[PDB]
């Protein structure tokens, strides 16, 4: 709604580095906000795609950023008989960056790991590895919950039970408020998928540089299931946290399984013990219902609400039987928590193959009205297909079914503008949350600042119905007497961080239904039924209302004595296009109509 599309911040990475694949906001100790940007194909020291994370400090012009120096180096440690190896080649360091408190968790899901025991081995499979860092102190740590030393033949002997070799842990990383890092490993348990949750403090306090296979004592992992539905579910493709069971002591995870039950797709809400509280099935197969999941209270009722994304939803148009556009589901949590059922809103994209719903970012309260707003990104939507982001405002019932604002890609085609979204953080500290969109195709990140929202109010008062010729105050510049009265319109402009130069424009139209220059009611001065005048409110808590004397034409002169006398009061921003970009957004009621009639014997 109020996200500025004219002045953008462009943060660049290395060429072909996928700079922008994932991003988050890191809050420096001093309250200074920085952006953590994953670049999962940055060149390593040995001229090879390894990964990387950049810590972009906030600026106005933007540009290049410094990078967090992690340990990009294959590791080999022989624990007696065995020989543990970690291969950091095309590991994808930066595919999931999440900042909590003062720590940054940057996960490489495709880091490979092998256990060479004599002739045998455990197979060089991708287990993933999250790298935790504290850029203000240098404390580095690593977390690889799925590393194992079990030989390959053992799984074959036991039907691949509890096989965590292909986890790619860190595919989707979240951090709860209590400081617990939760990682979704879609490929764990032989591509069933699992969740690996562990306190960040324990991760930092159980890591020793040189030891490759250790065990965090407080970590918890999901349960392997023999139910045929979960097979190839990719359960952990997207993960989010929220309150969904009542008690605020317990925190619940929302986990997406985009291919649950034969590509049908599902989203599971379950407590910390991984007991499935509720399951939200998909609607159309191969739609990837669960690709993105977000938790926010859009309707403001105090209960968290769920947003699911199916970027490959093929809508049933009248002309096109099945067109791939994408679809975002909104589920509203009612009282009686185990009753969340049918979807409450079904947003759908427009462009074909635009993948509407690839990223659902809770924006906070962008408009500052007491309801939560979200952003849904279609990385290949838009008429030219270069990428779009649609801002949806929250309301009492669900949220707005139309995009309040639409942001288009400033980058060439194929930039994947919108693949990564992150918001609800006031980057410039102007009282309004900003938004960061990552186009990894162009290796860049666009930062949108939310300009202030001026909430207007209009009150146009016409005292009563009047007689054609009361023979009161004379017609202007003449002794000829006419009927006269007063028109008073009070316009107010209330908002946060409004500048001191705010000057609205009041269009006062006298009986707009009739054609101008001969209206039934004119002004007692210039006689112009339509008067648009500037009214300045640059820091005025008191609405300003310049009363005007208005003249009424003779009973014989005006022949339509039965048509209602409807005055129009319109409020518009001044032509700020002459200077720089419009510094304010005039959201709210800015146009009203007031009707009266013709009275007799008065």
């Amino acid at each position: 709604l109020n996200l500025d599309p004219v002045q953008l911040t462009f943060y660049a990475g290395p060429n072909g580095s996928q700079f922008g694949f994932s991003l988050d906001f890191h809050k420096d100790s001093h309250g200074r906000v920085a952006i953590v940007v994953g670049a999962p194909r940055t060149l390593g020291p040995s001229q090879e795609e390894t990964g990387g994370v950049f810590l972009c400090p906030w600026r106005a012009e933007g540009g290049q950023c410094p990078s967090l120096l992690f340990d990009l180096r294959d590791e080999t440690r022989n624990v007696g008989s065995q020989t543990l190896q970690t291969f950091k080649a095309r590991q994808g360091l930066g595919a999931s960056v999440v900042s909590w408190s003062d720590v940054i968790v940057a996960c490489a899901p495709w880091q490979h790991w092998n256990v060479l025991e004599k002739t045998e081995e455990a197979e060089k499979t991708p287990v993933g590895s999250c790298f935790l860092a504290q850029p203000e102190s240098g404390r580095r740590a690593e977390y690889s919950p799925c590393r194992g030393n079990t030989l390959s033949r053992i799984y074959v002997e036991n039907d691949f039970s509890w096989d965590k070799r292909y986890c790619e842990a860190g595919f989707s990383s979240v951090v709860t408020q209590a400081g617990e890092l939760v990682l979704g490993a879609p490929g764990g348990y032989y591509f069933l998928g699992l969740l690996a949750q562990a306190p960040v403090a324990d991760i930092f306090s159980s890591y020793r540089p040189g030891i490759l296979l250790w065990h965090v004592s407080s970590q918890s992992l999901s349960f392997d299931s023999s139910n045929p539905e979960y097979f190839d579910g990719y359960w952990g493709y997207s993960v989010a946290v929220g309150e969904f069971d009542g008690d605020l002591n317990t925190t619940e995870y929302v986990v997406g399984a985009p291919t649950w039950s034969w590509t049908l797709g599902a989203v599971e809400i379950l407590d910390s013990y991984y007991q499935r509280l509720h399951r939200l099935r998909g609607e159309q197969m191969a739609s990837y219902f669960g690709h993105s999941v977000a938790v926010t209270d859009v309707n403001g009722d105090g209960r968290h609400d769920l947003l699911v994304g199916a970027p490959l939803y093929m809508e049933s148009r009248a002309d096109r039987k099945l067109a791939e556009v994408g679809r975002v589901y909104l589920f509203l949590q009612p009282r009686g928590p185990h009753a969340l059922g049918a979807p409450s809103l079904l947003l759908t994209g427009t462009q074909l193959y635009g993948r509407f719903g690839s990223a659902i970012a809770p924006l906070g309260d962008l408009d500052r009205d007491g309801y939560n707003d979200i952003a849904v990104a279609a990385p290949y939507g838009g008429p030219s297909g270069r990428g779009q982001v649609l801002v949806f405002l929250g309301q009492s019932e669900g949220l707005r079914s139309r995009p309040s604002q639409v942001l288009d890609s400033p980058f060439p085609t194929g930039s994947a503008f919108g693949f990564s979204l992150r918001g609800a953080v006031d980057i410039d500290d102007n009282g309004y949350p900003d938004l960061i969109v990552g186009a990894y195709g162009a290796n860049q990140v666009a930062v949108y600042r939310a300009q202030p929202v001026v909430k207007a109010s209009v009150q146009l008062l016409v005292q009563d119905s009047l007689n054609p010729a009361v023979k009161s105050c004379v017609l202007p510049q003449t002794k000829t007497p006419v009927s006269c009265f007063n028109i008073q319109m009070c316009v107010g402009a209330t908002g946060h961080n409004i500048p001191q130069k705010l000057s609205l424009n009041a269009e006062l139209q006298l009986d707009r239904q009739k054609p101008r220059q001969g209206r039934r009611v004119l002004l007692l001065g210039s006689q112009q039924a339509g008067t648009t005048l500037n009214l300045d409110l640059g820091g005025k808590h008191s609405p300003i209302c310049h009363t005007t004397m208005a003249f009424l034409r003779d009973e014989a002169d005006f022949r339509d004595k039965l048509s209602p006398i409807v005055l129009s009061l319109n409020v518009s921003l001044p032509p700020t296009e002459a200077g720089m970009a419009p510094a304010v957004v005039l959201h709210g009621d800015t146009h009203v109509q007031e009707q009266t009639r013709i009275v007799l014997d008065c």
């Binding site: 694949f21 499979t125 034969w262 970027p311 002309d319 993948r355 290949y380 220059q517």
Partner: protein
């Protein structure tokens, strides 16, 4: 009577005709009372104004190019026509609807292109042993139903990338079934084995030279193979004259789009032919799987019927895929594919047993309604597809176009086409919104105050500057009291003392 054209204001050829197709414009410079110019044709013809100078376009749909439906496509497949007519010119005024009919006949013996897409996963090894002599028996059975059969072959396992392909020890990169002590061949995404050709001996020879590979996960990179086979006309060698068949043989699930992110592959699949000179999919490791929507679009664009010859463990799944892609059907392959010949024959019969219309590049303004007239004279409205047909049967479809508003292009062409066939009807719709007299504008009409009013269509367009009857009202509205007031013979009070007599309202 009412003449809704007469009300709602009168502007020019555009407005009166845009109000309703039934409305007519009597541009002839007759009496203004005798030529209101915004009324129905029947009302206007009574009050003269029609020396063939009236404007009233009549919607028409002329058959520009029609040939009779063939009955046996044994010879000269290029000269075989299955859709009558082949090209029509349709004319529509704004907010008008008009219908026509098409006849679709599936010829008796049409040429057939069968391309065998084989899942070369290890569990499908036994199947490979029941396919060695498939060419000869397939030709023998198909010759009863065609005379220009051409068979091809392609193989697929999955993307040769880490989460699906074993990458340790390095011996497994050249024998992914080393540990089970057998010998397999390196993992391949999709390789085009045999180009479509009539010599079934070539098909039986290329088979017995194929070996299975080994993949980790149950889902197979199948839809990538379907996309590459479909979009590669030059390599696969599709004939744009034959019934394209694409038999899909598999036993497990399939990798839908967005799964390639499990391997670091995030670039979406584009419908391009990447099969290089080596007959190997050269972008399998650097391009995501195709989605159902893109696969369906490329199937329709190249006129390919899809047969999921899938084993009993996945049939329901692929059945649920069949009801997402037009022109596809699912057959129950066996564990060793011991009946794929019968499956292909019956699937081809069922595919020829249904005709479904498809609309291509239809302008958004046009809205179509379909009435299908199948065997006998029964006509089912609404639906655009009737089943139950056989080989040689003829069906008809009554199709109504219905434009809303008036596109500025005034001439757009769209396609009506039965699914799978190349035969198509090209409809060139011309929007007759404006008229000749509107184009014949005279802004300098001396009759209209020395030419300050566009005499376009008898009436004179002058706007608020001269909105009077003779383009004489120098100021907008009746305030200036345009010359030659309502006062009869002039010198009379306010239109005979009737106050504001408002032109003809006195």
């Amino acid at each position: 009577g009412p003449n809704i054209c007469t009300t709602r204001g009168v502007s020019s050829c555009q407005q009166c005709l845009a109000v309703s197709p039934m409305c007519a414009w009597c541009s002839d410079e007759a009496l203004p009372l005798g030529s209101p110019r915004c009324d129905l044709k029947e009302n206007l013809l009574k009050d003269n104004c029609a020396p063939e100078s009236i404007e009233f376009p009549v919607s028409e749909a002329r058959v520009l190019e029609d040939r009779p439906l063939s009955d046996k496509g044994s010879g000269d497949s290029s000269q075989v026509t299955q859709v009558s007519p082949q090209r029509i010119a349709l004319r529509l005024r704004p907010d008008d609807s008009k219908n026509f009919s098409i006849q679709v006949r599936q010829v008796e013996d049409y040429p057939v292109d069968i391309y065998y897409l084989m899942d070369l996963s290890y569990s499908m090894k036994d199947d490979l042993w029941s396919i060695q002599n498939l060419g000869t028996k397939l030709a023998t059975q198909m010759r009863k139903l065609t005379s220009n059969l051409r068979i091809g072959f392609g193989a697929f396992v999955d993307k040769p990338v880490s989460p699906y392909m074993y990458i340790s020890p390095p011996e497994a990169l050249e024998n992914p079934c080393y540990d089970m002590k057998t010998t397999c061949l390196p993992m391949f995404g999709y390789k085009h084995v045999l180009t479509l050709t009539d010599q079934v001996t070539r098909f039986n020879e290329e088979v017995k030279k194929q070996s299975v590979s080994r993949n980790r996960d149950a889902p197979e990179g199948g839809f990538d193979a379907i996309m590459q086979a479909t979009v590669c006309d030059e390599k696969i060698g599709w004939r744009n004259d034959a019934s394209h068949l694409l038999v899909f043989t598999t036993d497990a699930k399939t990798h839908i789009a967005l799964d390639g992110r499990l391997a670091g592959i995030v670039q979406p699949n584009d419908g391009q032919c990447h099969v290089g000179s080596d007959n190997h999919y050269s972008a399998s490791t650097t391009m995501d799987y195709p989605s159902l929507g893109l696969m369906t679009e490329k199937l329709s664009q190249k006129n390919i019927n899809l047969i999921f010859a899938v084993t009993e463990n996945v049939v329901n799944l692929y059945q649920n895929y069949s009801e997402l892609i037009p022109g596809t059907t699912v057959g129950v392959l066996s564990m060793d594919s011991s009946n794929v010949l019968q499956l292909i024959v019956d699937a081809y019969g069922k595919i020829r047993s249904k005709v479904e219309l498809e609309v291509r590049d239809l302008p958004e303004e046009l809205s179509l309604s379909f009435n299908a007239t199948c065997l006998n004279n029964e006509v089912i409205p609404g639906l655009k597809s009737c089943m139950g047909l056989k080989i040689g049967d003829t069906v008809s479809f009554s199709i109504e176009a219905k434009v809303r508003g008036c596109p500025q292009e005034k001439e757009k062409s769209f396609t009506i086409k039965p699914v799978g066939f190349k035969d198509s009807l090209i409809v060139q719709v011309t929007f007759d919104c404006d008229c000749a007299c509107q184009a014949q504008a005279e802004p300098n009409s001396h009759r209209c105050n020395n030419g300050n009013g566009t005499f376009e269509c008898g009436v004179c367009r002058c706007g608020p500057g001269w909105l009077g009857s003779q383009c004489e009202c120098s100021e907008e509205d009746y305030r200036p009291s345009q010359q030659d007031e309502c006062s009869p013979r002039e010198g009379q009070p306010v239109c005979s003392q009737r106050g504001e007599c408002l032109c003809g309202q006195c």
